[PDB]
């Protein structure tokens, strides 16, 4: 099972011999009963792997974590209640007051809020790099830096970073590369770990879940970053831990040190855990992830062709276009479809964008991306942003109906 | 309504005219479709109230929030993914790097981890007060303190704080009193807002949910802390916000300032949100909260009497007992039953505690509390000297008394006693 299409259905689960349930049960339980007191000792002492408490782990969530880990080619994963929480728990494990991270400036608005407003209240500052130039990432790094953070394809301008060059800059300064791969659709479009990323985060809310039913995040550990080698920047990864009678994580867990700490420390103490109900919804999504991503990208390519030749369209941003500023990176790293998104500029005054979105009858006007239903938004008049710009999350409806919906909306706004 | 038993079925929900659904629907949606672009702008610009995105709000969760606020007598509440998250979001809203909080030392271990290990990494330190004395709370406060934090009833020793005296100290120092009222059962046993608490947090995982199916937390805002009067310690409550283009929270939201910031800043940026499936589980729990807490407390009282007359028991720790160190506070603040917990010391060597628990066949052996099923643990040999500071002893069994028939609970301990002592 190299194949994503098979992993998305089978990885991380085998029917338990008690029930032999073919589908993944929903373990709607807070707790798990000890076999005896000494069993509980070993569980709480981390002396034995087992279910302790659903704030930390849950057999349903475990399948979701293992399956996403398998699809990204990581060693293991930890689920969170949202993508924001996946980002926050990651940075809070890597950095502490006085530390900083180096981040692309091309960010999801919620992530910018985190990096620019929330984390500085905890003494964690971010140096933003706008240029994408390796030299600029390198120059931003100082002795207090704890990560380079980039999105695998930014939103709504679809900048694809030089994963390999940036990973090397990070590794050569002793810090991990963290990649928000939400727009890589769970490893279908982009696999950052294959290109040097140490940690991958996702908003499972989007393409991973695929049906807009469920908020969720996930942190995937590549297992590839040597915390011992870089204990000068990450002493909590190796030094005796205040929370587990001096447990030394690296000594105990090796390549899983980071993701184990996420679970036994950060899930335990911040508590941004994922419901097993949410997990099951996401698993149903993941079972078709490859098929959906495949059709999403195919529809997106055709929609970009439609918008190129529309007399009402000023411009098109699509990472597959040769004119796109970071096309050589998209070409290099997106070999299974150029994602599910495009952005367009419409002709006319400032109200044109909103008229075109408001006139859509199939495409929905809302915040989300990565739903099976097509979504659009006029981001400046509502929520790389320009007032002619419409951002479009292309769904898996029949392409002719998506196109027709924009056609009738254009006819109404432009006669 | 005034009555807890009616509120827990009705507060915060009216059937929508579309479906007229009598029970609360599960809004298994991440998103909510705009009426138009201008509508989307007003929602995102906080110029209009309405559903935007389930990381921040959700009509199922909204019922859960409003119902818990009504039960506690707060103005509003915000749900979180867990009890820990409720505590964490609360402290992170009150304090930032270089600030501190003063807390009782009688703390849930996960809370102690937050205050002693996790938050200090973010420059947020805690001064612990062990004595319960008002003067020690007062002396621990300094100009960087941002809250006093206590549990309404600690565990496993069931210390009840002097809510009113502590709230007075806090309010004189210009800081809120934050109370973890998990062991007050949703406001059935203990009602800290009635006694000066400004912010109440819960592990809804426990008695609120009541069935051990669901992790969840909730933050309840009393609405009673005047952030403007105390803006010298809380400038972010009154000053123009960087998050929302200079939005001044107190000016816009007044008494809802804290809980509004929890939602529009902390749920939004930390993302520890509660699933609608979880909120629905919790709502089924809440619909019987009064009935369960009542039986819990009645069983717990009867079990205290059974244990205090058992030859096998060295001692009983129960907040309803006049010999309890903080009984005067328990008598004042717990008038609807003295809780659902107790602790006992068993006679014999150090293995007697783990043998009595291991020998239980009805009561379950696990670390959770606040299930309808009875639970017991020997914390010394399991979750936990450093143990002694925590209030844990070799001989202590901690019991979360369920709502089973108390005769069956007693029979279960009796046959385990017979097996451990002959």
Cα dihedral A64→A68→A74→A78 (10° resolution):
-40
Residue of A132, A157, A152, A151 whose CA lies nearest to A315: A157
- Alpha-carbon span A155 to A384, nearest angstrom: 8
Query: Do the domain assignments include residue B5?
Result: no
Which H, E and C letters describe A123-176, residue by residue? CCEEEEECCCCHHHHHHHCCCCEEEEEEECCCCCCCCCCCHHHHHHHHHHCCCC
Give the integer Cα–Cα distance in Å for B103 and B97: 17
A29 and A178 assigned to the same domain? yes
* B43 is a domain residue: yes
Count of CB atoms situated within 10 Å of the CB of B287: 17
Looking at chain A, which residue has its C-alpha nearest residue B272?
A272
Contact at CB, B53 and A367, closer than 8 angstroms: yes
Answer yes or no: do A281 and A357 share one domain.
Answer: no
Q: Which helix (H) or strand (E) holds A43?
A: helix A37-44
Using the 3D structure, point to which of A285, A308, A323 is the last residue of a domain: A285
Same-domain status, A300 and A251 = no
- End residue of a domain, out of B231, B251, B285: B285
**CATH number for the domain harbouring residue A385:** 3.90.1150.10
Gaps in chain B (C to N distance exceeding 2.5 A) after: 384
* Residue B4 located in a structural domain: no
Torsion of CA A273, A278, A283, A284, to 10 degrees: -170
Are A28 and B271 an interchain contact pair (Cβ–Cβ within 8 Å)? Answer: no
Are A389 and A260 members of one domain?
A: no
CB A108 within 8 A of CB A295: no
Angle of helix B59-72 relative to helix B276-286, nearest 10 degrees? Answer: 40
CB contact under 8 A, A34 and B82: no
Q: Which of B30, B53, B123 sits opposite A122 (nearest CB)?
A: B123
Measured CA to CA, the distance from residue A205 to residue A228 in angstroms comes to: 34
Same domain, A49 and A90: yes
B365–A205: do the CB atoms touch at under 8 Å?
Answer: no
CA atoms of A386 and A365, how far apart (whole Å): 17
Do B74 and B158 reside in the same domain of the chain?
yes
Query: How far is C-alpha B98 from the chain's CA centre?
Result: 26
CA distance B310 to B414: 9
| A331 CA: distance to closest CA in chain B (Å) | 32
Domain total of chain A: 2
Q: What is the 3-state secondary structure (H, E, C) of B34-99?
A: CCCHHHHHHHHCCCCCCCCECCCCCHHHHHHHHHHHHHHCCCEEEEECCHHHHHHHHHHHHCCCCC
Buried b (16+ CB within 10 A) or exposed e, A127-148: bbbeebeeeebbebbeeebbbb
Asked if the structure places residue B85 within a domain, the reply is: yes
**How far does the CA of residue B37 sit from the closest CA of chain A (Å)?**
6
A195: helix, strand or coil: helix
Q: What is the C-alpha separation between B326 and B336, in angstroms, rounded?
A: 17
C-beta atoms of B81 and A81 within 8 A? yes
Q: What is the least distance, in Å, from the CA of A275 to any CA of chain B?
A: 7
User: By the 8 A CB rule, do B220 and B72 touch?
Assistant: yes
Contact B366 A33 (CB under 8 A): yes
Quote the domain boundaries for residue B254. Answer: 11-285
B155 assigned to some structural domain: yes
User: In terms of domains, do B269 and B306 share one?
Assistant: no
Beta strands per DSSP E along B318-415 = 341-346, 364-365, 375-377, 396-400
What is the structure's resolution, reported in angstroms to one decimal? 1.8
**Mode of pairing for the β-strands spanning A364-365 and A375-377:** parallel
Measured in angstroms, the CA of A113 and the nearest CA of chain B are apart by: 7
Tell me whether residues A272 and B275 touch, CB distance under 8 A.
no
- Of the candidates B400, B412, B406, B312, the one whose C-alpha atom is nearest the C-alpha of residue B361 is B412
Q: Which of A92, A215, A365 has the CB atom closest to B54's CB atom? A: A215
Among the listed residues B235, B258, B242, B236, the one whose alpha carbon sits nearest the alpha carbon of residue B74:
B258
Whether residues B368 and B279 fall in one domain:
no
Which domain-ending residue is among A285, A313, A331?
Answer: A285
Contact A205, A371 (CB under 8 A): no
Considering the domain architecture, whether residues B241 and B321 belong to the same structural domain is answered as no
The CATH number of residue A177's host domain is 3.40.640.10
Is residue B17 classed exposed, middle or buried when 0-12, 13-18 and 19+ CB atoms within 10 A define those classes? Answer: exposed
Largest CA distance in chain B: 77
Q: In this structure, is residue B6 part of a structural domain?
A: no
Residue B27 covered by a domain: yes
Q: Is B36 within 8 Å of A358 when comparing Cβ atoms?
A: yes
Cα(B30)–Cα(B51) distance, integer angstroms: 10
Helix (H) or strand (E) run with residue A60 in it: helix A59-72
Closest CA to A260 of A413, A382, A89, A107: A89
Same domain, A245 and A226: yes
What residues in B contact A383, CB-CB < 8 Å?
Answer: 40-41, 44
Q: Give me the residues paired with residue B80 across strands.
A: B217
Question: What is the per-residue DSSP string for A25-42?
Answer: P----SB---SSHHHHHH
DSSP A297-335: HHHHHHHHHHHHT-TTEEEEE-TTSTTSTTHHHHHHH--
Alpha carbon distance B388, A171 (integer Å): 45
Q: Does A268 touch chain B (CB under 8 A)?
A: yes
- The answer on A315 and A264 residing in a single domain is no
Q: Experimental method for this entry?
A: X-ray
Q: Are residues B379 and B411 in the same domain?
A: yes
Q: How far apart are CA A171 and CA B56, in angstroms?
A: 36
Choose among A33, A34, A36, A11: nearest CA to A24.
A11
Residue B376 maps to a domain:
yes
Contact residues, chain B, for A205 at CB < 8 Å: 30, 55
Contact A215, B55 (CB under 8 A): yes
Q: How far apart are CA A32 and CA B181, in angstroms?
A: 24
Q: Which candidate in A31, A87, A94 is best for mutational testing of the B interface (most B CBs within 10 A)?
A: A31
H/E segment holding residue B121: helix B119-121
Cα–Cα dist B126/B114, whole Å: 10
Q: Environment class of residue A380 by beta-carbon count within 10 Å: exposed (0-12), middle (13-18) or buried (19+)? A: middle
The whole-angstrom distance between A1's CA and the closest CA on chain B is 32
Task: Residue A277: list chain B partners with CB under 8 A.
Answer: 275, 277-278
Residues A113 and A252: their CA atoms lie apart, in Å, by 35
The rounded distance, in Å, linking the Cα atoms of A287 and A280 is 11
Chain A residues closer than 8 Å to B29 by CB = 212-213
Residue A359 forms contact with B (CB below 8 Å): no
């Amino acid at each position: 099972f190299q194949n994503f299409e098979t992993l998305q259905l089978h990885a991380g689960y085998t029917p338990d011999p008690h029930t032999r349930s073919t589908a993944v049960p929903i373990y709607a339980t807070s707790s798990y009963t000890f076999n005896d007191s000494a069993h509980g000792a070993r569980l709480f002492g981390l002396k034995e792997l087992g279910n302790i408490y659903s704030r930390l782990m849950n057999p349903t969530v475990d399948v979701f974590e293992k399956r996403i880990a398998a699809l990204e080619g990581g060693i293991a994963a930890a689920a969170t209640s949202s993508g924001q929480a996946a980002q926050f728990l990651t940075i809070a494990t890597l950095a502490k007051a006085g530390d900083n991270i180096v981040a692309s400036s091309h960010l999801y608005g919620g992530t910018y809020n985190q990096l620019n407003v929330l984390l500085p209240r905890f003494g964690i500052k971010t140096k933003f790099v706008r240029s994408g130039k390796l030299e600029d990432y390198a120059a931003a790094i100082d002795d207090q830096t704890r990560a380079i953070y980039v999105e695998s394809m930014s939103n709504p301008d679809y900048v694809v970073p030089d994963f390999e060059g940036i990973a090397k800059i990070a590794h050569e300064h002793g810090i991990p590369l963290v990649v928000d791969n939400t727009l890589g659709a769970g490893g279908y479009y982009i696999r950052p770990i294959e290109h040097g990323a140490d940690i991958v985060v996702h908003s499972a809310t989007k393409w991973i879940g695929g049906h807009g039913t469920t908020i969720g995040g996930v942190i995937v550990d590549s297992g590839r970053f040597n915390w011992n080698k870089h204990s000068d920047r990450f002493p909590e990864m190796v030094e005796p831990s205040p929370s587990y009678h001096g447990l030394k994580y690296w000594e105990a867990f090796g390549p899983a040190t980071f993701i184990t700490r996420i679970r036994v420390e950060m899930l335990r103490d911040i508590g941004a855990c994922l419901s097993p109900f949410s997990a099951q919804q996401l698993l149903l999504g993941i079972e078709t992830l490859g098929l959906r991503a495949e059709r999403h990208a195919q529809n997106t390519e055709k929609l970009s062709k439609y918008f190129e030749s529309s007399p009402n369209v000023s411009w098109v941003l699509w990472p597959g276009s040769e004119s796109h500023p970071t096309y050589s990176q998209a070409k290099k790293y997106l070999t299974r479809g150029f994602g599910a998104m495009l952005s367009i500029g419409v002709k006319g005054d400032a109200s044109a964008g909103s008229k075109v979105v408001d006139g859509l009858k199939l495409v929905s006007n809302l915040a989300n991306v990565g739903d099976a239903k097509s979504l659009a938004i006029h981001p400046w008049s509502t929520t790389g942003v320009t007032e002619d710009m419409i951002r479009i999350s292309v769904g898996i409806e029949h392409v002719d109906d998506i196109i027709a919906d924009f056609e009738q909306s254009f006819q109404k706004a432009y006669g």
